[PDB]
Amino acid sequence: AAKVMSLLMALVVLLIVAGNVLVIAAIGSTQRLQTLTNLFITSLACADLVVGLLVVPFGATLVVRGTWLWGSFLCELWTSLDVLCVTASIETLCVIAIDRYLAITSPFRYQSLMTRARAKVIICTVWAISALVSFLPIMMHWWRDEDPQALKCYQDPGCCDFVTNRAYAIASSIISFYIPLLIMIFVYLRVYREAKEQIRKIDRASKRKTSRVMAMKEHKALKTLGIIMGVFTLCWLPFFLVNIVNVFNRDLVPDWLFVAFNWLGYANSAMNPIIYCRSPDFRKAFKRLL
């Protein structure tokens, strides 16, 4: 187990850095890939890349050694960088859902509505929000619990557990995960509803001569739309569900499972290159890069 667990963490960091480096390289190097949507994909890839370089590796050690080897300052700063990048990943995922919703349902309105400069502001907003959810509260100790047993971890530099007060845990989890999850569900459900209402209008248009059935394109779209909500939810719902659970009754869910679910969330950062960069221009770029 502990030999296999250590090996498993290694390729997770490899997959994350490889994928996201490949994406950023492809977008930066290809004139054809520098679209509006891929600008938001670039934000996402940056976030997930920093996860693979700094965040996950230090998280790997803390599990393998069983303790924090780099002192209370870097514990805080690593924790702040972790929360920031995860917040920015999840919120950028949410922006992309919106961008594709508008690009598919209202394509002509969207072109005038969304400029490159407007997208840049949106990206900067997301990182600013991510910063203010992460660094500002964490470095200023607004997260801290009053509890003496929690305060023993804050005093010990070898302890780098993220034990938060009730208020932070709820607010930060809502802002970074639950609100984005709802927006993604709402947004992508209108994409489903728009497509299904449009298939209805074709059946009426025929004057009762044909009834449409799901073709190749519809089955794939619904699979794709599934993968997006599926992998995102699978990866972060467990960790963020448990994150609220421990606010009420801390003993119910064990520490090993809480950390196991956080590794599942780190796995998302490896999946995002696979989900969001399958376009034929991406595929061409990836082969040209390799």
């Epitope: 209202s106 299904k196 073709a215 394109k217």
Partner: nanobody
Framework: QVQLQESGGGLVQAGGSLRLSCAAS????????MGWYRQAPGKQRELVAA???????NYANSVKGRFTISRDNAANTVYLQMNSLKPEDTAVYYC??????????????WGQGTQVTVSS
């Protein structure tokens, strides 16, 4: 395969009329844009007109008020009703489908092209 069959073009007198028609045979996702682009002699391909599945429409300035892009509500077929033609409208007109079935990106289809020539 998805294939785009263009028709309705040819020679015509200035101040005249034509009605292009592109019938898209094959599997297309319900959400899409059917459009007409044109490539004038020794010039870059430009948008003429385009119509979403929803029904919103976008025309290029030159052809505003004259041309009308409509689509068959039943089939995957799009019509560009070209009125009040001028010799500058002379070009190879290409049918186009932007297919949104991947969600994150869009896949394109282009017709072979059909010649429209407007004499003075």
């Amino acid at each position: 395969q998805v294939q785009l069959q263009e028709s309705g073009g040819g020679l015509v007198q200035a101040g005249g009329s034509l009605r292009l028609s592109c019938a898209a045979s094959g599997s297309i996702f319900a959400l899409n844009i059917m459009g007409w682009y044109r490539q004038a002699p020794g010039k870059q391909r430009e948008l003429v007109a385009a119509i979403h599945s929803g029904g919103t429409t976008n025309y290029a300035n030159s052809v505003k008020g004259r041309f009308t892009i409509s689509r068959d509500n039943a089939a995957n077929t799009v019509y560009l009703q070209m009125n009040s033609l001028k010799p500058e409208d002379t070009a190879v007109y290409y049918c186009n489908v932007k297919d949104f079935g991947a969600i994150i990106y869009d896949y394109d289809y282009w017709g072979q092209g059909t010649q429209v020539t407007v004499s003075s």
